[PDB]
Structure formats: structure tokens, C-alpha cells
Amino acid sequence: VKDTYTDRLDDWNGIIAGNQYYDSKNDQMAKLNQELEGKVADSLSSISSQADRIYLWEKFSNYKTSANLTATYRKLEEMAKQVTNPSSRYYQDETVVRTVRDSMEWMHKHVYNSEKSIVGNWWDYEIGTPRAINNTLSLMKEYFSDEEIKKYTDVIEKFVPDPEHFRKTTDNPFKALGGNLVDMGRVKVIAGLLRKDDQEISSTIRSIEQVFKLVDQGEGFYQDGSYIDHTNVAYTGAFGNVLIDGLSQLLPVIQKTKNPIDKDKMQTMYHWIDKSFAPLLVNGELMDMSRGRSISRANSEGHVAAVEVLRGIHRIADMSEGETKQRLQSLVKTIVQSDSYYDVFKNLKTYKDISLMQSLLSDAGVASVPRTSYLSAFNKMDKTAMYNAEKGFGFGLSLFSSRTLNYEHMNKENKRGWYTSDGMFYLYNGDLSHYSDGYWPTVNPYKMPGTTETDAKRADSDTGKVLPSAFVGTSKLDDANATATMDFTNWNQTLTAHKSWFMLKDKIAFLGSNIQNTSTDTAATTIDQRKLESSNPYKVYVNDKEASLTEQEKDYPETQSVFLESSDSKKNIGYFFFKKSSISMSKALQKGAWKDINEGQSDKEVENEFLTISQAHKQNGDSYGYMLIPNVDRATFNQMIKELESSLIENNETLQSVYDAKQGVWGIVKYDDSVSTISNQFQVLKRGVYTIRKEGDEYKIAYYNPETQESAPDQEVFKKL
Numbered sequence: 073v074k075d076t077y078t079d080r081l082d083d084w085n086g087i088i089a090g091n092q093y094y095d096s097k098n099d100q101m102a103k104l105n106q107e108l109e110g111k112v113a114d115s116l117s118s119i120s121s122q123a124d125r126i127y128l129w130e131k132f133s134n135y136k137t138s139a140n141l142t143a144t145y146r147k148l149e150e151m152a153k154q155v156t157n158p159s160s161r162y163y164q165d166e167t168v169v170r171t172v173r174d175s176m177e178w179m180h181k182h183v184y185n186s187e188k189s190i191v192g193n194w195w196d197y198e199i200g201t202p203r204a205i206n207n208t209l210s211l212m213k214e215y216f217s218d219e220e221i222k223k224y225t226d227v228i229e230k231f232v233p234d235p236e237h238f239r240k241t242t243d244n245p246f247k248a249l250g251g252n253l254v255d256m257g258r259v260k261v262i263a264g265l266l267r268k269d270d271q272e273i274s275s276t277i278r279s280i281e282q283v284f285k286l287v288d289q290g291e292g293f294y295q296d297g298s299y300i301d302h303t304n305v306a307y308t309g310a311f312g313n314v315l316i317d318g319l320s321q322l323l324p325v326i327q328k329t330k331n332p333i334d335k336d337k338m339q340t341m342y343h344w345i346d347k348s349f350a351p352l353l354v355n356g357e358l359m360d361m362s363r364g365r366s367i368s369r370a371n372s373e374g375h376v377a378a379v380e381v382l383r384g385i386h387r388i389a390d391m392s393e394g395e396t397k398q399r400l401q402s403l404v405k406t407i408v409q410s411d412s413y414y415d416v417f418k419n420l421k422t423y424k425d426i427s428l429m430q431s432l433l434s435d436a437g438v439a440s441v442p443r444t445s446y447l448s449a450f451n452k453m454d455k456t457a458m459y460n461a462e463k464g465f466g467f468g469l470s471l472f473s474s475r476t477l478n479y480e481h482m483n484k485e486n487k488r489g490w491y492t493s494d495g496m497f498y499l500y501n502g503d504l505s506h507y508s509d510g511y512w513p514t515v516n517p518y519k520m521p522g523t524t525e526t527d528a529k530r531a532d533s534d535t536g537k538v539l540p541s542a543f544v545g546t547s548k549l550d551d552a553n554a555t556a557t558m559d560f561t562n563w564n565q566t567l568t569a570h571k572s573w574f575m576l577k578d579k580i581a582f583l584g585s586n587i588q589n590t591s592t593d594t595a596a597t598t599i600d601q602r603k604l605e606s607s608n609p610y611k612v613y614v615n616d617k618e619a620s621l622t623e624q625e626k627d628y629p630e631t632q633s634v635f636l637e638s639s640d641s642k643k644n645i646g647y648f649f650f651k652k653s654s655i656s657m658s659k660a661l662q663k664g665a666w667k668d669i670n671e672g673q674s675d676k677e678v679e680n681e682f683l684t685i686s687q688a689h690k691q692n693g694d695s696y697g698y699m700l701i702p703n704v705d706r707a708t709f710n711q712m713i714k715e716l717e718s719s720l721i722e723n724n725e726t727l728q729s730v731y732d733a734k735q736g737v738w739g740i741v742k743y744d745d746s747v748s749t750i751s752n753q754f755q756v757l758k759r760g761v762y763t764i765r766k767e768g769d770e771y772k773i774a775y776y777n778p779e780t781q782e783s784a785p786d787q788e789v790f791k792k793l
């Protein structure tokens with residue numbers, strides 16, 4: 073017979089497989105089931121047989137590569153899903169049942185058991201493999217005896233005995249937090265259920281509860297929405313995904329155990345969704361600046377990664393109720409519906425998830441209204457996300473400081489993300505596929521957009537660094553206006569620049585001063601490197617005069633503006649140079665392979681066309697200043713830049729400021745404590761970042777000191793003249 077433990081595992085199966093929700097007449101479900109049918113068949117026809125072999129599958133033979141461990145167990149899990157799916161051609165198949173039971177025994181005797189030691193990555197020994205095993209056993213529990221289950225999970229207890237720590241069999245174990253902490257639950261809570269071990273369950277759950285705390289230091293979610301992981305990396309979009317994705321699968325089960333989690337304790341979850349996740353999603357795309365090294369993975373481009381968060385959010389809404397359930401549903405609905413590029417079902421991998429998404433999209437009772445404008449200053453992870461609902465464009469500012477790592481290159485992934493945080497900017501417009509379709513393996517890693525750098529060669533073997541300066545941060549006035557700055561110094565301290573950004577509702581001014589180079593390499597700022605669509609060509613205008621770009625760089629001296637004109641106004645990009653400047657442009661096909669940036673990816677060649685614009689800085693004390701104006705047609709652009717003829721208030725080594733006359737808003741960055749009189753109306757007195765709005769004879773002030781990470785009383789930083 074059985075019990076409440078199996079009852080929980082039954083619940084878990086419906087969440088992880090959802091065989092009980094399958095419907096052959098359901099288009100989406102049938103498609104996933106067909107995908108699983110093909111996998112099992114491939115696995116079944118390639119599995120080695122006769123006289124105990126040296127590998128189950130030739131592709132994952134080398135048992136010294138921990139990867140081959142969980143990839144092998146995942147193949148049995150797939151078999152477990154189909155074998156328990158009444159609509160599968162493998163339903164209760166004697167061969168498939170024996171193959172799983174045999175493969176478990178073989179692997180246990182020769183590759184993964186209690187007498188072994190972590191060989192390769194610990195993750196596979198404590199997370200990857202134990203999960204695949206728990207799932208396989210949970211699904212086929214009616215084919216395995218309890219003795220066999222215990223026997224097969226003992227090794228999991230060996231490698232992961234402590235619900236609070238990972239790598240417990242090593243010399244350098246670590247306290248499980250965030251995503252890892254959630255993975256700890258999918259490992260020990262399930263194993264606990266399978267082993268009918270209450271202690272394991274309660275302790276692991278008690279341990280999981282730690283995930284609900286907001287932090288003000290270290291890894292985790294901060295009150296400002298930032299999410300830090302791997303000590304000091306902005307990671308909402310990769311580890312955050314795993315956290316929400318995994319937690320949402322677990323909660324329903326945990327909540328039905330002897331130790332359910334208090335409602336109040338789970339409160340923060342909605343804080344993550346609203347403050348941390350939502351702002352990073354633009355037209356179904358999860359901003360790459362928050363995905364760490366995941367960006368180097370071919371099967372995880374922006375829209376795909378976003379579904380990871382969305383399915384988690386949807387699962388949460390589903391266990392919620394009333395308003396909370398309602399608004400979360402609308403949130404998922406509208407995001408999914410705004411995505412005209414990626415089919416959300418391509419990354420919904422269980423029948424329950426597919427089913428939930430179908431009823432949501434078809435339920436007219438659930439409002440799907442375009443999201444309104446917002447600007448999130450994630451100062452605790454040095455990132456800034458901006459979105460204009462009226463004009464429909466998104467903007468992401470990627471930086472780092474003494475508090476954060478610039479880029480993550482680990483496990484051979486993201487070998488060339490060197491400059492992706494050196495003041496790199498992201499523009500999300502009509503082209504929802506911009507940062508997809510092989511953008512990453514084809515983008516020139518030496519000219520990330522918005523970054524100022526020398527052309528020195530870089531080594532793939534390099535790893536991240538924190539920034540010398542702490543003067544990096546964003547002062548947000550409201551949902552449409554904010555100012556940011558970065559006291560920049562390049563990787564080898566040969567170049568510096570005071571880089572500042574002024575987000576003014578429907579445009580962003582880029583200012584750079586104090587540019588210095590002590591090296592022999594050339595210094596230049598990449599104004600942009602935009603990925604083109606062969607289907608939607610741009611007509612390039614320089615100073616409102618058609619220009620023909622070539623692979624070979626062309627120089628445009630005395631350039632006052634550049635305009636990228638598409639047939640779709642929502643894909644237009646204009647650049648107004650406050651002062652006539654010398655720039656270079658070129659359009660060229662850029663080839664590459666994912667393997668180039670991620671050892672474990674395919675070496676198949678990829679290619680994309682890119683339009684590159686940059687400004688060389690040949691002298692010390694150089695600078696740049698331009699306004700980025702997207703989503704307006706040519707005639708409107710040409711008109712807008714005439715009005716903007718005097719928006720630049722200043723741009724030197726101590727003061728940088730842009731003024732929006734239409735809005736009555738000022739963006740200001742001060743590098744010293746001198747008294748700065750602005751537009752003869754007011755005086756700003758402290759080193760820091762400001763965003764001020766004049767409303768009549770009144771002034772709205774948004775002041776931020778990025779070093780101390782504090783604001784300050786109005787009279788300390790601002791003086792009305």
C-alpha cells in the first residue's frame with residue numbers, strides 16, 4: 073500500500089509532468105508529447121546493450137565529466153514521463169520499464185553511488201543528477217519498491233546531507249542561498265518524500281524559508297528590486313529564474329506537507345515579481361544585462377529565458393487568490409500577448425503549464441492591458457531598466473562598480489562578455505528579435521554599444537573584475553526620468569571616462585567627459601552596434617542626407633545627427649550630437665559560433681548584419697555627447713533635434729547636465745562639491761547624481777550619492793536662487 077508521502081509525490085508528478093492533464097485533442101499538449109516521444113525513441117535506439125558496456129549512451133560515456141551524469145539520468149526521466157502517459161506509445165511498455173529499472177541499477181553500481189566522490193562539477197552530484205533521479209523515481213514509483221527507492225536515493229543523502237549547505241563532502245562547502253537554496257528543496261524535499269523521511273522534509277523546508285528574506289548585503293533580493301548572486305553579480309535573470317521557477321513548482325507540494333510555510337513569510341514573493349522581475353521583461357523578453365553568463369547559451373536567448381520567469385509567476389498566481397491572482401494573471405497575459413516574436417508554448421514543458429497558459433489567454437475575464445511606463449533604478453546591482461508605454465520602447469543601462477562584478481565568465485561560458493557592463497546600453501524596440509537569432513555569438517565583443525574602450529586584444533580566459541570606483545549609480549525622479557553616472561576605468565587602468573546618462577521620458581542623453589588614455593591602443597566609444605533584419609532594411613541618414621554604408625568604415629566629420637529609418641517607425645533610431653562630432657559607421661556581416669563564447673555550445677556557424685557607429689577619442693580630455701531618440705519618424709526627429717539645440721547644459725570633468733525644456737526636467741551629475749548654478753534658476757551643491765523637475769515656482773528633487781548609497785536633505789544638495 074501507500075501514504076500521504078505518495079500523495080505528495082502524486083502532486084509533484086502533476087506539476088513536473090502533468091500526464092493527468094494530457095489531452096490528445098489539445099494542439100499544444102500533443103506537440104510536447106510528440107517531442108517527448110521522439111526523445112525516448114532516440115534514447116531507446118541509441119542506448120548501448122549486451123554484456124555490460126562502458127557507457128549507457130556513447131554521447132555521455134565519459135563518467136569523469138559530471139555533465140554526462142545528469143544528462144544520462146535526465147534521459148531516464150524522459151522515459152519515466154512517457155511510460156506513465158496513457159497516450160504515449162511507450163505507456164507501460166515492458167522494455168521501457170525494464171530499461172529504466174536496469175539503467176538505474178547499472179548507473180548506481182558503476183557511476184553514481186555513496187562510495188563515490190565528486191568528480192568534475194559538484195552541481196551535477198548535488199543538484200542536476202539528484203533532481204533527475206528524484207523525478208524518475210517519483211514518476212515510476214509504482215514500478216519500484218520502497219527498498220529500491222531508498223537504495224537509489226541513499227547516494228543523494230551522501231552528497232547532500234545538509235539542507236543548509238552544498239558541497240558538504242568537500243573542503244569548501246557553502247551556505248545555500250537563492251536559486252541554489254530552491255534547488256536544495258527540489259533535491260531534499262522530494263528525496264524526503266520518496267524516503268518517507270519527515271525530518272528531512274521539515275529541516276529542508278525550514279531551510280527553504282530563508283529564501284523569503286530580503287537582504288541589504290550579499291546574495292539575494294534587495295528592497296530596491298536588485299538580485300545578487302555568485303557573491304556580487306547582477307543575476308535576477310538567470311539565478312532569479314531558477315529561484316522563481318523552482319519555488320513555484322515546490323510550494324504546492326510543501327504547502328500540503330506537515331510543515332506548510334506561513335502566508336506572511338511568502339509575502340515577499342510578490343515583491344520579487346513586481347520590483348525585481350516585471351521591470352526586466354519587455355515585450356516578452358528578459359533583459360540580458362540580468363542573465364549573467366546564460367546569454368552565451370544558444371537555447372536560452374531573451375524571450376526563451378523570460379518564459380522561465382513567466383511560468384513561475386503564472387504558477388504563483390494560480391496558488392494565489394482574488395486580486396493578487398487576478399493582477400498576476402493580467403501581468404502574465406499582457407506580457408505574453410505583447411510578444412509577437414516568440415511563441416510562449418515553446419518553453420512550457422509540462423501539460424499543466426500548457427493548460428494553465430491556454431485558459432489564461434482565452435479567459436476574457438482576465439484583463440490584458442498594455443503595461444504602463446516605468447523606470448527601475450536597481451542601484452544594488454548597478455542596473456537600470458526603463459520603459460515608455462506611449463512610444464513603446466525599452467532601455468537598459470548595464471554597469472558595475474566596486475560593489476559588483478562587470479561580467480561572469482565561468483565554466484567556459486561567456487568567454488567574451490568583457491565589456492557588457494562598461495556602460496553598455498540596451499534598446500528594446502519594434503524588433504523583438506534584436507538580441508536573439510544569434511546576436512551574442514555574432515556581435516563584435518570589442519565594441520559593445522555605449523562602451524568606451526581601447527582596441528587592445530583581450531583573452532577569452534580572462535574573468536570579471538569589480539570597478540575601482542564606487543561612484544556609480546542612478547537618481548530616479550519618477551517613472552519617466554532618471555539620471556545615472558559611472559566613474560569609469562577600463563580593465564587595465566589605461567583609460568578613464570566620466571560616463572553619464574540622462575533618461576528623459578522619450579529619449580536618453582549620453583554624456584562622456586574626462587576621457588583619458590595612457591596606453592598606445594586607440595580609444596573610442598561605440599555609439600551603437602545594431603543587429604539588422606534582412607527583411608526590414610534601414611535607410612541611413614547622416615545630417616538628414618542619405619548615406620550608403622559599407623563593410624569598410626566610412627568617416628563622417630561634422631556630424632550633427634544620424635538617423636536609422638525603417639518602414640516601421642517603432643524601429644527608428646536617431647542620434648543627435650549636441651556638438652558636431654567625428655564619427656565612423658559601417659554595415660557588415662559578422663560571422664561567429666556559439667562555441668566561440670561558450671565551450672559547451674555548437675560550433676555551427678552563425679551570422680548577422682550589424683550597423684556600427686563609433687567616435688574615436690584621440691586626445692586626453694576628450695568627450696562625447698549625443699541624444700538617443702527612438703520610435704519617431706524622420707520629419708519628427710529632425711524637428712525634435714532643433715528644439716534640443718540647447719539641451720546640453722554642461723559636459724566637463726566635474727559637471728554633466730542636460731535639460732528638457734518641454735518637461736522642465738534637469739539631469740545633473742556632479743563629480744565634486746563645488747557650487748554649480750544651473751540655468752540661472754538653482755544651485756546644486758553636492759557631489760552626486762540629480763534629477764530635478766520645476767513645477768511652477770516649486771522644484772521636485774531626486775538626489776543620490778552613489779558612493780554612500782544614500783540620498784540627502786534637500787537643503788544639503790539644492791539651493792533655489
Ligand SMILES: CC(=O)N[C@@H]1[C@@H](O[C@@H]2O[C@H](C(=O)O)[C@@H](O[C@@H]3O[C@H](CO)[C@@H](O)[C@H](O[C@@H]4O[C@H](C(=O)O)[C@@H](O[C@@H]5O[C@H](CO)[C@@H](O)[C@H](O[C@@H]6O[C@H](C(=O)O)[C@H](O)[C@H](O)[C@H]6O)[C@H]5NC(C)=O)[C@H](O)[C@H]4O)[C@H]3NC(C)=O)[C@H](O)[C@H]2O)[C@H](O)[C@@H](CO)O[C@H]1O
Pocket residue numbers: 087088089146149193194195200204207208246251252302303310311314317318321366421422483
Ligand atoms: C567553479 C565552481 O564550482 N564555482 C563555485 C560555484 O559553482 C557553480 O554553481 C552554479 C550554481 O548553480 O550555483 C553552477 O551553475 C549551473 O550549472 C549547471 C551545469 O552546467 C547548468 O545547467 C545551470 O543552468 C541551469 O541548468 C538546468 C539544468 O540544465 O538542469 C536548467 O534546467 C531545467 O530547469 C527547469 C526549471 O524547473 C526544470 O524543470 C528542468 O528539469 C525538468 O523539469 C520537469 C518539470 O518538472 O518541469 C520535468 O518534469 C523534469 O523531470 C525535469 O528534468 C531543468 N532541466 C533541463 C534539462 O532543462 C536551468 O534552467 C538553467 O538555468 C547553471 N545555473 C545557472 C543559473 O546558470 C555552476 O556550474 C557551478 O560551477 C558555487 O555556486 C559558488 C557558491 O556561491 O562558489 C563557487 O566557487
